[PDB]
Every structure is written in C-alpha cells, then in structure tokens.
Design a protein around this motif. Structure first.
Motif, mmCIF file in Angstrom:
data_model
loop_
_atom_site.group_PDB
_atom_site.id
_atom_site.type_symbol
_atom_site.label_atom_id
_atom_site.label_comp_id
_atom_site.label_asym_id
_atom_site.label_seq_id
_atom_site.Cartn_x
_atom_site.Cartn_y
_atom_site.Cartn_z
ATOM 1 N N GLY A 87 0.592 -1.135 -0.063
ATOM 2 C CA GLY A 87 0.275 0.097 -0.471
ATOM 3 C C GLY A 87 0.795 1.603 -0.121
ATOM 4 O O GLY A 87 0.569 2.171 -0.013
ATOM 5 N N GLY A 88 1.819 0.896 -0.528
ATOM 6 C CA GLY A 88 2.979 2.144 -0.532
ATOM 7 C C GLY A 88 3.200 3.207 -1.468
ATOM 8 O O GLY A 88 2.058 3.049 -1.950
ATOM 9 N N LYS A 89 3.110 4.311 -1.232
ATOM 10 C CA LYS A 89 2.676 5.455 -2.175
ATOM 11 C C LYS A 89 4.216 6.111 -2.878
ATOM 12 O O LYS A 89 4.771 6.122 -2.310
ATOM 13 C CB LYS A 89 2.455 7.043 -1.001
ATOM 14 C CG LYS A 89 2.791 7.281 0.198
ATOM 15 C CD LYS A 89 1.901 6.359 1.017
ATOM 16 C CE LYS A 89 2.834 6.449 2.499
ATOM 17 N NZ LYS A 89 2.445 5.341 3.886
ATOM 18 N N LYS A 90 3.749 6.372 -4.243
ATOM 19 C CA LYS A 90 4.236 7.212 -5.072
ATOM 20 C C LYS A 90 6.183 6.411 -5.164
ATOM 21 O O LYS A 90 6.927 7.434 -4.572
ATOM 22 C CB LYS A 90 5.074 8.880 -5.154
ATOM 23 C CG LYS A 90 4.504 9.140 -3.696
ATOM 24 C CD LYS A 90 4.044 10.810 -4.535
ATOM 25 C CE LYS A 90 4.072 11.242 -3.023
ATOM 26 N NZ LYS A 90 3.855 12.893 -2.839
ATOM 27 N N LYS A 91 6.140 4.650 -5.222
ATOM 28 C CA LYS A 91 7.057 4.230 -5.086
ATOM 29 C C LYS A 91 7.387 3.272 -5.804
ATOM 30 O O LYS A 91 8.880 3.357 -6.535
ATOM 31 C CB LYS A 91 7.195 3.224 -3.533
ATOM 32 C CG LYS A 91 5.666 3.275 -3.032
ATOM 33 C CD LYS A 91 5.820 1.786 -2.096
ATOM 34 C CE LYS A 91 6.450 2.406 -0.512
ATOM 35 N NZ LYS A 91 6.093 1.481 0.371
ATOM 36 N N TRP A 92 6.422 2.471 -6.586
ATOM 37 C CA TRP A 92 6.910 1.944 -7.476
ATOM 38 C C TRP A 92 6.978 3.145 -8.599
ATOM 39 O O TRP A 92 6.366 3.772 -8.425
ATOM 40 C CB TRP A 92 5.055 1.058 -8.362
ATOM 41 C CG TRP A 92 4.550 1.697 -8.731
ATOM 42 C CD1 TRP A 92 4.914 3.519 -9.824
ATOM 43 C CD2 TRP A 92 3.007 2.502 -8.643
ATOM 44 N NE1 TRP A 92 3.932 3.649 -10.542
ATOM 45 C CE2 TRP A 92 2.794 3.650 -9.332
ATOM 46 C CE3 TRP A 92 1.522 2.198 -7.983
ATOM 47 C CZ2 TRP A 92 0.952 3.793 -10.330
ATOM 48 C CZ3 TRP A 92 0.478 2.119 -7.677
ATOM 49 C CH2 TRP A 92 0.497 3.277 -9.679
ATOM 50 N N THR A 93 7.715 2.777 -9.728
ATOM 51 C CA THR A 93 7.814 3.376 -10.407
ATOM 52 C C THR A 93 8.929 2.843 -11.749
ATOM 53 O O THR A 93 9.877 1.830 -10.908
ATOM 54 C CB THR A 93 8.673 4.776 -10.177
ATOM 55 O OG1 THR A 93 6.960 6.013 -9.402
ATOM 56 C CG2 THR A 93 9.190 5.359 -11.022
ATOM 57 N N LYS A 94 8.531 3.308 -12.941
ATOM 58 C CA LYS A 94 10.360 2.810 -13.710
ATOM 59 C C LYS A 94 11.345 2.156 -13.377
ATOM 60 O O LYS A 94 12.059 3.340 -12.546
ATOM 61 C CB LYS A 94 9.861 3.997 -14.984
ATOM 62 C CG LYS A 94 11.255 3.553 -16.140
ATOM 63 C CD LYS A 94 11.010 4.837 -16.817
ATOM 64 C CE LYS A 94 11.397 4.470 -18.151
ATOM 65 N NZ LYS A 94 10.659 5.449 -18.840
ATOM 66 N N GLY A 95 12.085 1.806 -13.391
ATOM 67 C CA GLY A 95 13.116 0.872 -12.792
ATOM 68 C C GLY A 95 13.074 -0.373 -12.794
ATOM 69 O O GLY A 95 13.153 -0.747 -13.929
#
Ligand SMILES: [Mg+2]
Ligand SMILES: [Mg+2]
Ligand SMILES: [Mg+2]
Ligand SMILES: [Mg+2]
Ligand SMILES: [Mg+2]
Ligand SMILES: [Mg+2]
Ligand SMILES: [Mg+2]
Ligand SMILES: [Mg+2]
Ligand SMILES: [Mg+2]
Ligand SMILES: [Mg+2]
Ligand SMILES: [Mg+2]
Lengths: 192, 154, 125, 150, 105, 67, 93, 143
Positions: free
Chosen positions: G3-11
RNA sequence: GCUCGGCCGCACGCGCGUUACAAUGACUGGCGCAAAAAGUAUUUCCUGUCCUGGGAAGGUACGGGUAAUCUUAUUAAUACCAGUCGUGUUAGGGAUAGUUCUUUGGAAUUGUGGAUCUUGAACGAGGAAUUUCUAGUAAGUGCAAGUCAUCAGCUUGCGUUGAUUAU
C-alpha cells in the motif's frame, strides 16, 4: 623490526614492477611503512606533496567523501581495515598487494580533452599522466562502492573489499571502476 | 532466539487487535505501533505490564496476550500506568482518563472539532476552513494544500 | 438526549461555594488547564469582577423573552467563568463589538477565542 | 601485585561492578525506574533492564575519580545531545531523580560520603576508606584477569 | 617593625601608560631600604569586543566594524609601612589609570 | 584485449596548450619492445614532471604547436 | 501486501527476497553446523545472502556458531562482522 | 636546595598540550594518569607507540615517563602525547647522557616522522563577516 | 498618551536558509578530549553544593564571585567500544494535530519557550538552470556573543573531527 600494516600486513610483501608508478605511490618508502593510515600529514601543500602519502591514507581520504555522512576519518580508517581483513579471507594475499594492483589497473591511460569551437564540441587524443592516473584509479574505485552500498545491507567494508579484488582482476563486469577505465579509453579512442 | 518448532502453525503471521489493527511479524513492541494509539515507547510499556517478551518476535503471543492488550487499553490506569503516560487526560469537564484507542481516538476528535464547530472559536473555526492553527505563517507555508490538520496514515 | 460537561449546577455551587470570594474559587481551579490556573493563581484583575456582575443583571432582568442585554467589553483576555454562560457579551476585536451567545462549552477558554480579529482570505485576480 | 581503577578501562569495570550489586542486590530499584522513563529527553526507553545498576555502578567509578562532583554536573557529565527536529541539536542535561537516588544508595552502602568540610560544595559525595577499597578489589580482579589472558 | 603587605593594582585602557606606572613603581620601590617587592605581575589582557554593522541605514552589502578596547591589569605586591607606600606613589601618572591599594599584615 | 602499450618517459616538458589551460605538451623518449629511443611530442593532461613514464596506446601520433 | 505510496515506478523490478525471522527445529541444528555454505568470509551480509536470514537473526546464528567453537571472529564493529570458519570451508554436501 | 633527576618535555598540536615528565626507572607510561592502553581512539593508540618501537624497548625499559595531556580534540591530544614522548626521550639524553646519543635518536625520529619533534604549525583560521564561515559566503543570485 | 487590533492576514510567484531521504545509518548504554566569549545596588547577573519532583521545573537548605581568584581549568558535539533494529517511506524523517504539566510576562488565546503520550504528511538524492570554494580551508559538528522578560531556524565569533582536485 618491520612495522606491519594494521599490525598484520608486511609492506615489503609488495614491489612496484612497472616504473611508471614507482614514485607515484607509497608502499616503497621507509617512512611509508605505517601501522595506522592516520598521519594528519601536511600533504597537499607544495604542488606534488600528495605523492608522499601512504597509499591507503589516500584511500581513506577519498572514502570519507560524501557530504553529510562523511568528513570523519576516524571511522573511515575502519571501513578500510575491515575491508582489508575481508579481502584477505578471500585471496589470503597481502591485501596491499591487491589494493596496489587495483590502483595500477583502474587508472585510464587515455582521455579526451573537450575543445569546442563556436558551438561544435570537438575532442582530441590525450595521454593520462601518472599522478592523475592513480588519483583517477582510487577516486573511481571508491566512487563505485557507494553506488551499490546505498540502500544495501552490503557494507562499504564489503562493497569496497569486493571492489578492490575485481579491480585488480580487470574483470570488466565486476567493477564500476574498470568499466569507465575501459569506456573512457574507448570513447577517447574514438574522439582521438 | 527464533527456534520455532511447528512452523506454519506454531506461529501466527497476522493477529487481530482493536478492529482494523492487523499486525506485522517482526518484533512485538514495534508491531503494536500500527495501532492508532500506541507508539514507539508505549509498546515497550505494555510489555513490562504484561511481563511479555519484547526482544521476542511478533505473533508468538496467544489470544490471551491479545486480550491482555485490548483491556489493558480499556482501563489502562487499572493495571497501573501513571496518569501522565496516557493519550487523553480529563475530557469534556468530567470523563477522568482514557487511552485513545484505534477507533475510539478517531471519533473522540470528530467530537471535539464538533465541540468547536458549534462553539466557533478561532482555533475551532480554523480547523473547519482547513488551515494550520498554531503554525501561523501562511505566506510560504504549505502551498498546494498540503496536509492540513489531523493526520491519518493510508 | 444531550448533557453538559461537568454539571452546570454543581459548578454554580462550586464557584459561588461557601467562599464565593475571588471570581474563580480554588474549586474551579482544579478544572482549568495549566495556563488558565497560572493566571488566576498568579494575579487576576478586579475589573474582571465588575464586568462579571454586568452580565449578572443582564441574565435576570431580561424576561424569558430570551432577549439578553448585550454587555460590551475589551477584556478579550477573560476566561469564561461558569456563571458567564447564557449571556451574550459584545467583545471588541479591532473594528467593533462582537455579540456571542455563551454556551456551556466555551468555559475555561479565552473570551477572545470567539471575537474574530481578522477576516481570513477569499481570492481571485 | 595490585591495580586500581585507573588501570582498567571502566567501560569494562562497570560491566563488572554492575553485577556485584546484582548478586548482592544491596539496592532496591525504585518505583519510577522500571516505570519506563528514559533519562533526560530522548526516544525509546532503555533496553538493558539493569540500567539502574549500571548507572550507579559507573556513578561510583565517576565519584572515585572526581570527588565533590555534583548532581547537576553529573547530570551534564553523562553526555547527551537532543534532536529537536528542525532546530539543530542542543546539549542536554540528564535526570535528577534517578541520579540523586543513586548517590543516596551508594552512601547507605558505605561507599559514598557527604563532606561537611569544604565550604564550597558542602555535602558533595566522595569515596570512603571502606567504599574505595571495594572498588580496587573489583579492579584488581579484572586487572589480574586481563594479565591472565596469556 | 610594623610590616604591612601592600597590593598595588593598576588597570588601564591602553598599554602605553600602564607600563610606565608599573615600570617606575618597581624602579622606585626597589630603591628604598624598607622595601620588599613581588615582581610586577601581568594579569591576562581582557578584551571588550563590539562588532557593528557600519552604515546607518541597512543598505549596500554587509559591512562590519570590529571595535576593541583593551584593558591591561598589572599587580604589584609590597612589604612596607604605611608611609613607605605614599612615598613611592608620588609619581606623575597619566590620566585614566586606576590604582587600587590593599593593606594586610 | 590485445594492446600495444609501449612505455615511454618524459624527455622535456614543452609548454601548456588547449585554452582549457590544463593540457600539457611533452617530448618523450621510448623504452619498450617494438622500437625504443624514438622521440615523440605527445599531449598529456594531469600532473607530470620531467622523467616520468607514460603508457602510450598509439605510437603513431605527436600533434604539436608552440605559438 | 503493498500500500506504499508513489514508490513503484519505472526502474528496477527486483522482488525483495523474503528473509525470515523464524527457523524450524528440523533445520535448526543442520544449518548451524553448516557454515562452509556461506562463502569463506561470514559477515552480517553474506549470512543473509545465502540463507534469507536478516542480520539480527543471522548474528545469533553467528554468536551461536562462535559459541560452538566452530567459528572465529576477525573484527566486530557497528555493522561489520568479520568471521572465519575455523579449519577451512571444506563442505560441499 | 634540591635537584631531582628529571626532564620536562612538551608536545602540542592545535591547542593539544602534552606535559611529559621523564625520570629514570623501569618503563612506566602515564598519560593523564593512566596506561596508554586506555586512550580513547583505541586506534590512534598505535600512533603513540610508534616512537617507542621506532627506538626499541631498550630506552623505554630503563625509564619512567609520566605525561599529562589536556589538549583540544581526541586526535590532536594523541599527537601531542606522541610529540612529548619523542621530545622527552631525546631531551633526557641531552642533559643526562652523551650529547652524541641525543643526535642518534633525533635523526632516528626525524627520519621516520617530523610530527614527533617539529610542531604542527597550523591552527584554526578566524571567520569573516563576508559570509557564513571562514571562507564561504551568503549565496549570490545573478541572472 | 490609553484600551484593543496589525504588521505573522492566503489561490499563488520569487530569495536567503533549517531538517532529510538513512546502515559510511537510527535508537540504548558507556566514555575525565575543546575554544571563545560573557556575569549583580538588597534576592534583582553567572550560578556551584544540597533537597523535592517522572519530567520541564521547583525550593531556599549551604555557598563563591561585581573576577586568571566564583560559575571553571571544567557540562560541548562529531568521534570511539558494546548492545537492539535489519531494508522494510519501517520511521530513517520529522511537518500537522489532540488533551495534560511547566516556566517568562498585568496579559500569551492569532499555540512565547519548554516536558509528556499519541498522531506521523512530502521526502526514495531532486529538470532548465545556478552559488560559494584550494588547507587546519570545503564539510560536519557542537559552544558562545548580539537581539532578549520570554522567542532563534538569522547574525558576529569559537573550537573539535577533518579530505578529493588543482597550483
Ligand atoms: Mg550516545
Ligand atoms: Mg554509528
Ligand atoms: Mg535552581
Ligand atoms: Mg557559562
Ligand atoms: Mg527498531
Ligand atoms: Mg515528538
Ligand atoms: Mg492551545
Ligand atoms: Mg512548537
Ligand atoms: Mg553551524
Ligand atoms: Mg541570556
Ligand atoms: Mg542567545
């Protein structure tokens, strides 16, 4: 009697075979044979003092280099000692005779000088000096350690250890250091 | 140590506490912190009262250990705990003491801001409109409506 | 089915107790926050007492026609006293006087907390 | 031969005296203590449970070296910094409750003494003949054990 | 022999003048027979610092004036009678030079 | 990686070049298997004294200027 | 589970190896006696590297082996633990 | 009248001051009133033994050297405690031995390290109202 | 002159800065290392010893100093040894907010400052740009002094730890 490094690493266990590095390194001197890499010396004063610096003192210095986290040699002397123990437990060699080799390998022999004329960015073939070569070598080695070392449980004394090893090997797939060492020459061999 | 015997069953990955408080398997005191009411040091207090192992992992405590906590929180003052370690102290001019529970807390606030919404006090009105109360400076401070007052994790 | 904090009456007996001397008997003291207790236990003014009585007359004389005589004051530093509930006091802010109906809830709180001292900001450009 | 505390890293010695008071439990861990209340103003409550013993344990080591030191000074001398958050870190004073108790207890133990002579710090705590002897023993015991590490 | 230990204190805003009194007080006391003098002792030079933002109106860059007032304190001890001192204090010492005296036995 | 690294040392430090005012021009003498003795006027970058030793990865060069 | 916020992301799409905080009695002994499995040198890291055991746990497994006169400490600092398996890593199943 | 058989040598490093007293005996090493083995940075401890070893257990074994140091920082003090030893061992041999033996040890140390006899000249450098520190300054937006 | 407001008002646009994104780290405990500044007319200034409080802080029990004599030759913090946590926006980080307690001041409510228990946001090393900076210098780290009843995230100084690259 001979003062071993960290109390357990004979200095005379190494020799500089290539003539290039002979004067641009520290293992060789009587004054260089130190127990501790801390000298609070006064190098960096004349315009070539840096030479007379016990190679590892240099490593420690270049090592405590990231802002906030760093600026305290105290600790850094440690990260380097543990790293030497760790390098030994793997190749059981006089870890100076390892770090030393690595220093000789990780230093680019060629670079390109950016000389731009009216917008266009041209470059030329330049042969890299010795003092500059060693400097680059260490700077590079350490540079990488932090790379992985970040959000990793892997420790600098470990990252660094693992680096100094491959850096001696020339293992172009295991040394952020030697990667550039090669690329810088390659790209440079292109601009030339 | 962590010398468990019957893996998959001799352990409970998730325990249920005070409604939606699901717990993580790592360390007990800390695990407690997820509860909207307990924190870093309150968890440690709890373990000294229930003589429960702190250093020990999380979830290696039966439902007995679980209730010990649900009621420990219901009337904490009863097990001891000096009045000055509580989240809430002397409410609405009568209600003596409490210990803001995960769900209790949420509404207690809904009632106090309501307490003020009707009153129309500056501090009260402030919350309504949605602006820091004490933090005073509005020129540069929280722009692009950042986090107002009362904060809930999600 | 709603009630009030600590019993509006217990306090009228608590405040006007055997020794209804200083506006805030040491009784009410046990009730207020440290800051308020600080002040009273320190050095509260007498003017705050004649203002008191001014509300008094306003609360009784007025018929159950619920039309209280607004009492005007600059004593924005006054902390509402139990017996001060029910009256509508006009409090100065900067421009004029503010009329506020005193509810049981606004006790122990500074009388100033209701006389808005500035009109927050609307916007556009 | 024989050795004094000055011949033993006390970080090591306290690790010894802390216990000599345990087996002997000559003391009595006060109320507020176990009652979780880390020293000064910090984050978490201590971890080691016998901190009570360790504190006094060293407090003896301290007094055996700096006779006449005071409450408010030891309070400082323990060494504490505070993360106020945004505002930088300021140096912090300790806790006078646990501290002053420990001196009283060490006095009941016949190790600490309240000098009623030096008109500057009248009643400051100092080692006693019997009191300091007890220390050198622990020290010498440790001393001899270090020399024993052939 | 009614011997009285005398304390000569000299505090001054500038060194030029205070050094003359000191130098001559001893020069003069050594030369008397009923005299015993403890060398002229120089206490640590106290310095009062006042740093000031130059300009009156706060415009233009940051300019700071570092002003100093130095205060030298010299102390001399004497073995004499009460008349002996008043005999040696008969100088012609500069202005702003404070001289205090303490008499003990 | 089969390179022809002929080791050569500094004979005379000419001057500085590349308005980057950091590059150095130097006259070299060789010491390696291939030839040896051959003198070249190469362009360095970095700290360099008289008599050092530098590994040239291309003996067919020697750019130059002195004005 | 996340449920972590704006962490997933291209990479990097690197699944965080699920280290564990528990060890069954059926493996307890077997693993303690097998140090030669985690490379020559044993540090908080290496231990986690081969066994999926987080440091805090790994330490006890180290102190444990250290206790069972099976391992020797080289250097011990803040997070740097250098241990050598006495005799030499000569275990290959 | 009196006249102990003693030598008084000092070492200093950026405020670090080393009071070193040397009297003849059986090899004692006091630093602020304790054995070297207890200095703060277990690390730098070696630095202090450098002089000792560089000369030989010989000279150290015959004498009792007591040092007191209340310099500035952990590291610096060590440098002074170091410098005092070196200066004292040499200072002893000057008035209490053949002036020739002094020359031996002096060059002996000098050859290995100057920080044992020389004095690390540099101190701190005072700030300037020109900015936030000794040589740094308030930002400067140009555009 | 007096009473009460305001200069801190908020959709936003700029400019110094403070704290940080964490294992070259955080937290618990241990550890005699510093410099420079300051300080009263009676209690009114620095405050040591002692007593009481969980704590901030109280008391006035015993005291020195109008100062190389007294707060002090010490009460810094980074650092160092041990222990817990173990990559997990976890709490690293601490904004926002809620009772309580305490100090300054007639008055603090449009939170003076400080303590307690909770709450626990953005942040995962930052685009175009762009500022200082070559040695006990950058940086980090705390301490003073001005302002001051109370208030430093500013300023002016001070010392400790202490390097890359140039010349
Ligand atoms: Mg600490
Ligand atoms: Mg650390
Ligand atoms: Mg007091
Ligand atoms: Mg002071
Ligand atoms: Mg934790
Ligand atoms: Mg907090
Ligand atoms: Mg409030
Ligand atoms: Mg605040
Ligand atoms: Mg700073
Ligand atoms: Mg002040
Ligand atoms: Mg101030």
């Amino acid at each position: 009697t001979q003062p071993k490094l960290f109390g357990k690493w004979n200095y005379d266990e190494v020799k500089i075979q290539d003539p290039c590095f002979q004067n641009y390194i520290a293992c060789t001197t009587t004054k260089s044979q130190v127990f501790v890499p801390h000298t609070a010396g006064r190098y960096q004063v004349k315009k070539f003092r840096k030479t007379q610096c016990p190679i590892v003192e240099r490593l420690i210095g270049t090592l405590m280099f990231h802002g906030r986290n760093a600026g305290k040699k105290a600790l850094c002397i440690k990260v380097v000692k543990n790293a030497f123990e760790i390098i030994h437990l793997v190749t059981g060699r006089n870890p100076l005779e390892v770090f030393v080799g690595a220093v000789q390998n990780a230093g680019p022999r060629e670079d390109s000088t950016r000389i731009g004329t009216a917008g266009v960015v041209r470059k030329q073939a330049v042969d890299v000096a010795p003092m500059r070569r060693v400097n680059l070598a260490i700077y590079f080695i350490i540079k990488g350690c932090r790379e992985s070392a970040f959000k990793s449980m892997r420790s600098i004394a470990e990252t660094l250890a693992d680096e100094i090893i491959n850096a001696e090997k020339n293992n172009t797939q295991s040394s952020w250091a030697i990667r550039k060492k090669d690329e810088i020459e390659k790209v440079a061999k292109g601009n030339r | 140590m962590s010398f468990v015997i019957e893996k998959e069953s001799d352990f409970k990955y998730i325990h249920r506490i005070l409604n939606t408080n699901i717990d993580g398997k790592r360390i007990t005191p800390i695990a407690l912190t997820g509860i909207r009411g307990i924190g870093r040091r309150f968890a440690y207090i709890i373990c000294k009262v229930l003589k429960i192992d702190p250093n020990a992992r999380a979830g290696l405590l039966t439902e007995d250990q679980c209730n010990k906590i649900t009621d420990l929180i219901a009337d904490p003052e009863a097990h001891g705990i000096p009045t000055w370690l509580l989240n809430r102290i002397n409410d609405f001019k009568d209600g003596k003491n409490y210990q803001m529970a995960s769900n209790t807390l949420d509404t207690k606030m809904r009632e106090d801001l309501e307490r003020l919404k009707k009153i129309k006090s500056h501090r009260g009105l402030r919350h309504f409109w949605g602006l820091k109360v004490r933090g005073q400076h509005t020129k540069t401070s929280g722009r692009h409506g950042v986090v107002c007052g009362v904060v809930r994790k999600n | 089915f709603t009630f009030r904090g600590k019993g509006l009456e217990e306090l009228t007996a608590l405040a006007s107790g055997s020794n209804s001397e200083k506006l805030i008997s040491d009784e009410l003291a046990a009730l207020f926050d440290a800051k308020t207790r600080r002040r009273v236990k320190r050095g509260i003014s007498e003017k705050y007492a004649k203002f008191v009585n001014k509300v008094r007359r306003s609360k009784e004389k007025c018929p159950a026609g619920e039309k209280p005589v607004p009492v005007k004051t600059h004593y924005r530093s006054m902390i509402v006293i139990p017996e001060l509930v029910g009256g509508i006091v006009g409090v100065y802010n900067g421009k004029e006087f503010v009329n506020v109906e005193v509810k049981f809830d606004m006790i122990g709180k500074y009388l100033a907390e209701f006389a808005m001292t500035y009109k927050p900001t609307t916007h556009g450009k | 031969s024989f050795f004094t505390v000055k011949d033993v890293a006390a970080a090591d010695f306290i690790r010894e005296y802390a216990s000599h008071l345990k087996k002997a439990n000559k003391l009595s861990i006060p109320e507020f203590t176990q009652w979780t209340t880390t020293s000064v103003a910090r984050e978490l409550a201590p971890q080691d449970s016998d901190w009570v013993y360790i504190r006094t344990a060293a407090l003896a080591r301290k007094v055996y070296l700096k006779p006449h030191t005071g409450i408010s000074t030891l309070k400082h001398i323990f060494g504490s910094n505070k993360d106020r958050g945004n505002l930088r870190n300021k140096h912090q004073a300790c806790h006078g409750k646990i501290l002053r108790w420990a001196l009283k207890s060490l006095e009941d133990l016949k190790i600490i003494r309240k000098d009623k002579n030096s008109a500057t710090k009248k009643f400051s705590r100092v080692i006693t003949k019997e009191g300091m002897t007890e220390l050198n023993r622990i020290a010498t015991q440790i001393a001899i054990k270090q020399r024993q590490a052939k | 022999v009614k011997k009285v230990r005398v304390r000569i204190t000299l505090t001054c805003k500038n060194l030029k003048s205070v050094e003359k009194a000191t130098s001559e007080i001893v020069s003069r006391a050594k030369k008397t027979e009923q005299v015993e003098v403890k060398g002229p002792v120089r206490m640590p030079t106290k310095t009062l610092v006042i740093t000031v933002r130059k300009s009156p109106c706060g415009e233009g860059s940051k300019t700071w004036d570092r002003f100093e007032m130095r205060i030298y304190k010299r102390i001399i001890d004497l073995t004499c009678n009460v008349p002996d001192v008043k005999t040696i204090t008969n100088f012609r010492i500069d202005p702003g030079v404070e001289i205090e005296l303490t008499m003990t036995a | 990686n089969t390179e022809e690294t002929t080791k050569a040392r500094i004979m005379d430090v000419l001057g500085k070049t590349g308005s980057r005012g950091g590059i150095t021009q130097v006259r070299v003498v060789l010491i390696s298997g291939k030839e040896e003795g051959r003198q070249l006027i190469r362009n360095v970058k970095g700290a360099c004294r008289v008599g050092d030793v530098l590994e040239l990865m291309e003996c067919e060069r020697e750019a130059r200027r002195l004005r | 589970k996340k449920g972590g916020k704006k962490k997933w992301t291209k990479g990097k799409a690197k699944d965080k190896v699920n280290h564990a905080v528990f060890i069954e009695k059926k493996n307890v002994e077997s693993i303690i006696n097998n140090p030669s499995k985690v490379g020559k040198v044993l540090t908080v890291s290496t231990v986690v590297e081969k066994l999926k055991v987080n440091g805090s746990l790994a330490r006890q497994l180290m102190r444990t082996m250290a206790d069972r006169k099976l391992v020797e400490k080289v250097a011990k600092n803040g997070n740097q633990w250098v241990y050598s398996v006495i005799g030499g890593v000569k275990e290959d199943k | 009248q009196q006249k102990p058989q003693l030598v008084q040598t000092f070492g200093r490093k950026k405020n670090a001051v080393a009071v070193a007293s040397v009297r003849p005996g059986k090899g004692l090493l006091k630093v602020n009133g304790s054995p070297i083995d207890m200095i703060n940075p277990q690390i730098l401890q070696a630095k202090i033994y450098e002089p000792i070893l560089l000369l030989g257990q010989q000279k150290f074994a015959n004498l009792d050297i007591r040092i007191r140091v209340r310099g500035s920082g952990y590291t610096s003090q060590v440098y002074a405690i170091r410098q005092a030893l070196s200066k004292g061992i040499v200072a002893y041999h000057a008035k209490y031995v053949d002036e020739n033996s002094k020359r031996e040890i002096k060059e002996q140390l000098m050859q290995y390290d100057r920080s044992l006899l020389v004095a690390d000249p540099r101190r701190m450098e005072p700030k300037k109202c020109g900015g936030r520190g000794a040589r740094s300054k308030m930002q400067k937006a140009y555009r």
